[PDB]
């Protein structure tokens with residue numbers, strides 16, 4: 001599982017080289033290409049690489065083994081790195097928008113002295129790097145246009161999701177009438193599930209010559225449902241997870257997030273409870289965060305979650321049973337195993 | 342010339358409609374699509390539309406008149422609007438990065454109450470709209486991939502140019518050792534000339550079935566040279582233009598810009614003059630801006646410019662003479678006329 005990750009990371013060095021080869025081919029833009037290198041190195045490294053690696057794993061599980069030459073494998077690693085660049089673009093930009101301080105345990109790029117709002121253009125460069133790598137490595141392949149369109153569409157979906165989230169949950173303005181279940185699912189589907197789960201498997205599919213509309217739709221159905229549970233579990237763990245196991249010490253409640261937890265809370269709350277939420281949700285003070293968390297436990301949200309994880313796992317297994325064919329079920333089950341661990 | 346502009350603007354209403362049709366096809370994301378509409382309407386309208394209109398004018402001059410049906414013309418307007426969306430994406434983002442207050446005589450989008458840094462995601466949406474329109478209108482055409490690659494490449498070039506500019510001219514830090522002629526030309530070529538002049542004519546060329554590498558290179562040579570003079574003239578007019586004729590009251594000097602003017606000044610300045618520049622360039626006070634402007638006139642920069650405009654016009658005419666064929670020279674001469682007016 002995580003021997004493949006060392007191999008993925010070692011490929012980065014070449015991605016960076018080929019993207020910053022213009023340091024001397026046109027000398028004039030050298031300093032800009034040096035800055036691009038620093039942007040790539042700071043923002044594309046330090047994550048867990050789950051999205052990029054999924055491209056490689058899924059590719060190897062989908063392609064006939066005697067069409068896995070060195071050049072094929074290299075295209076798969078490169079396209080994995082494209083998914084990671086897309087992720088990096090979103091995170092740099094989201095951090096600016098949310099005023100975050102840290103990411104992946106280090107200062108956010110935009111908070112670095114000397115960067116600041118220049119990070120907006122750095123993020124656009126990271127995005128642009130995707131299409132430069134696609135062209136460099138995949139332009140003669142029959143799936144080239146399909147991949148370009150898949151990355152463009154995944155960016156749109158994600159951005160639209162971000163818009164929805166920004167409207168739903170503006171910092172420093174509590175309005176819980178916004179935090180409905182239909183809205184939560186919609187945010188998760190567009191902002192997270194499409195790029196995190198559909199994108200990497202679809203890309204592997206296209207690379208394997210699997211281009212059919214119907215097959216893509218079948219896999220999408222499985223994968224967007226998995227993505228929904230992934231985010232719900234992320235929301236739950238934000239507050240209730242062991243921090244030496246997650247890494248996170250959560251701030252969803254302080255940040256006025258449309259969390260699965262606040263959604264559930266609101267569905268179950270008496271009016272006296274709605275009031276406790278109104279007075280304490282989306283504020284900085286520890287005692288106020290304690291209040292919300294106490295309210296969550298009083299309503300047995302951990303028991304709700306555990307039940308919800310069980311029903312969700314059965315449903316995902318049924319979706320796999322119904323929609324995986326003719327793909328090998330292992331493509332989806334590998335993901336299910338990680339998510340439901 | 343400017344009857345065609347009313348026609349271009351009237352087409353916007355349909356661009357907006359087709360991009361925000363999802364307001365009821367998926368109801369969940371309705372509020373986000375409403376926000377997209379407001380972003381489009383505020384940021385794609387209010388400019389002079391020169392870049393988009395160039396696509397339409399050049400298309401009509403390049404295509405055989407009995408391949409200009411209603412659907413062709415519509416694709417040309419749409420692709421013109423794509424160039425305008427690309428422009429809108431860059432301007433929204435640049436305004437945030439520069440901390441500007443106004444644009445096109447109105448408050449900058451990000452300065453609107455309630456927007457703020459959410460404009461970063463608004464800008465990404467504007468970019469994404471380009472590829473949604475290309476797909477909606479041009480996906481079955483033989484030039485589809487060529488246009489997608491042209492817009493992606495124009496975005497990269499522009500972003501790289503912006504990086505170079507940000508490194509060269511950081512606000513609140515005067516360093517004139519950066520402001521060399523080689524650097525100025527490099528910024529202009531990447532940040533301005535490619536998207537403003539090459540992009541719209543190249544797009545019209547691809548739409549007319551003119552896809553040859555050689556022809557694109559020939560036209561690019563003419564067009565990047567024209568773009569260089571356009572920006573130089575913009576820099577000159579920033580300070581010396583009549584504001585009821587430009588619209589601008591200039592702030593290049595206050596903003597520590599790598600202007601053609603400061604570059605020229607530096608080439609001609611004694612060390613005592615270099616000092617006046619060092620002490621007064623890139624500062625807010627009116628008397629300090631007066632100093633720089635006085636220095637410019639003492640070195641006869643307006644006479645240098647006028648001479649430079651003459652040599653530049655002859656050179657552009659020679660480039661047209663040598664590189665326009667087999668395109669009709671009118672494609673380039675229309676631009677020359679506007680630029681050198």
Ligand SMILES: CC(C)[C@H](C)c1[nH]c2ccc(-c3ccccc3)cc2c1CC(P(=O)(O)O)P(=O)(O)O
Nearest residue numbers: 047048049050051054196197234237245246338339
């Ligand atoms: C390590 C676990 C404590 C944690 C809950 C987890 N579980 C996962 C299950 C699946 C995936 C995943 C797999 C493929 C594509 C995208 C995500 C990531 C995570 C992750 C890590 C996620 P997270 O940090 O939880 O949002 P990342 O965005 O990949 O870093």
Ligand SMILES: CC(C)[C@H](C)c1[nH]c2ccc(-c3ccccc3)cc2c1CC(P(=O)(O)O)P(=O)(O)O
Nearest residue numbers: 388389390391392395537538575578586587679680
């Ligand atoms: C109106 C003039 C006082 C002014 C100097 C001018 N001259 C031009 C010449 C050519 C073009 C142009 C033509 C095609 C593509 C791009 C620009 C724009 C301008 C412009 C307007 C430019 P500007 O505002 O000068 O940078 P815009 O970016 O199109 O608004």
